Structure 1
Amino acid sequence: MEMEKEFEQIDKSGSWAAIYQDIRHEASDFPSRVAKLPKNKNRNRYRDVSPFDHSRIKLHQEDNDYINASLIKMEEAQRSYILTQGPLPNTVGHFWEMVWEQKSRGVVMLNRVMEKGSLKCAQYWPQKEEKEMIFEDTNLKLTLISEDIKSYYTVRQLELENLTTQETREILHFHYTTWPDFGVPESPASFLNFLFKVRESGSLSPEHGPVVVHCSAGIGRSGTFCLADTCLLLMDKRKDPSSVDIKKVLLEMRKFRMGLIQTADQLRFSYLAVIEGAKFIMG
């Protein structure tokens, strides 16, 4: 079925939970043996969220190459994404090592450091120009260059230096700051505006390594971001945009990381975003 009318049909019939459970039943199951080794327990935020072995990002280290991060490679859309958990106190150096080694331009953050009164990720970037951060375990230096605070999101320019080679690179930090503590946004308008700002920066383009996207577990909000982006790109590429099937795209992405889209409300929100976005792209 088309999307917008499939949407109204699920709303009128109140069957979002049943649709979402079908997706959960049909989703791929691949091994995640490296994630579950005992030496990696303090590298995982949640015991039930792990990268598959076949698609995990490897650190270029011979001691321990493990990080909770997955490469999502979308062949028809010609887009790649790295989805990862919010960094832990003992993995902030690993996180920036990955950004460096994978040649990423942009980092997309979809959570606040504190939500619901608890910490959802480490403070992993510097908050003042004159107070830079050094990660001694991976030999990197990170400096805040500029910060632009808007009503729904903040964009930061950061300088990452490999202290071993003295090479430097500019990283863009796109921070969506207004996702509610409970539920999903009422309107997708500010989320779509944010997605378009990431796009306009070049961070998603083939001349760079894959964008790094995270929330707390790296599957819910993060899944919503890459699902909406890929579906909108496919609608631009195909002769028949109504052929794009968001449930099929989601199941393809779940071949590369488990659990993408965590609730039926996040599934409905993804439909809403793609539907509204497809009208702005044109006419």
Structure 2
Amino acid sequence: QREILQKFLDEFANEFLKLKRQSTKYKADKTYPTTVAEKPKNIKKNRYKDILPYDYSRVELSLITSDEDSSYINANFIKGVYGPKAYIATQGPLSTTLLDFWRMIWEYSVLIIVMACMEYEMGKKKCERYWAEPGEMQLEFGPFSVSCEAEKRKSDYIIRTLKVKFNSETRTIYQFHYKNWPDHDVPSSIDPILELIWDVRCYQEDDSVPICIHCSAGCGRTGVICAIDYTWMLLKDGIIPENFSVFSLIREMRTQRPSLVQTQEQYELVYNAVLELFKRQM
């Protein structure tokens, strides 16, 4: 009646293939419409054509800074342990969505940005810079002034303290840019990911505002950090559901954004990562 001996420690392609399914039946049934993302006037706001935000969950921008700003951005709200608007899963912005990117951050009061990519990965472009680098002059993205004061550089990730001056108003955002990525079957490379989630949660915990989290397409590594962050936030309150499961968690998280964890490797890391968390703590 109170697992304070969290016995969860106890093939993987099979649980996952079940997630592959579901999201197949979801479409054949026209369950989660992505119509707003298919509008002819947004075709250039999506980094991939087959990765569209669900309407029902899409983040809608109201903050208008021009006679052209629409209410659109590839972004979805992921609920936390207590409710919705806990997480904001998004794609790396494009040259044409930076301003959209910053409006969102601003309109929702986001204080923490976790980017799980590298400008370039494997000789390829994955993200358009939206952040400011120290030493540089300010970088204007429409009416938003992005600056950088300092940045802690750890072994696997960087902490960028950014100063965003919209009008004459100034907010301080914290960018956690995660370069290297620790794959699955390397039970030791996971540690740093927890390093991050703990570090992140050291800046923002019991705060109304969401944590903007994005990788490139906003669904691969982005889901992992959320799923993991979510199980550990549960673990942090022992509120872990009795029948809790890494599968169950990804399932519904996969209800907010299409393919929130797109590879088995990612599915397994999410798993060995929850395991370590429980093994630990105690």
Query: TM-score normalised to the size of structure 1?
Result: 0.87
Q: Deviations over 1:47-98 (max 9, x none)?
A: 1111111111111237411000001123547771000000101111111110
Segments ≥4 residues shifted beyond 6 Å: none
- Percent identity between matched residues is 34
Structure 1 gap segments, 5+ residues each: 6-14
Q: Does 2:9 align with 1:4?
A: yes
Count of residues in correspondence between the two structures: 265
Over aligned residues, Cα RMSD in angstroms? 2.1
More helix by percentage = 1
Residue aligning to 2:17: 21
Residue aligning to 2:3: none
Give the number of the structure with larger relative contact order, counting CA–CA contacts within 8 Å between residues 6 or more apart. 1
Q: CA deviation at 1:233?
A: 2.2
Q: 1:162 aligns with which of 159, 166, 182?
A: 166
Q: 2:114 aligns with which of 91, 104, 108?
A: 108
Written as runs of structure 1 = structure 2, the 5 A alignment for 1:1-283 is 3-5=8-10, 15-27=11-23, 28=26, 29-60=31-62, 61=64, 63=68, 64-74=70-80, 76=82, 80-136=86-142, 139-163=143-167, 166-179=168-181, 184=184, 186=186, 187=188, 188-202=190-204, 204-207=205-208, 209-238=209-238, 243-281=243-281, 283=282
Structure 2 gap segments, 5+ residues each: 1-5
Contact 1:133 1:141 in 2 (8 A): yes
* DSSP-derived class of the 2:43 partner: helix
Separation (CA, whole Å) in 2 of partners of 1:218 and 1:39: 21
* DSSP-derived class of the 1:226 partner: helix
Separation (CA, whole Å) in 2 of partners of 1:44 and 1:276: 36
Contact 2:117 2:216 in 1 (8 A): yes
More strand by percentage = 1
Separation (CA, whole Å) in 2 of partners of 1:142 and 1:69: 21
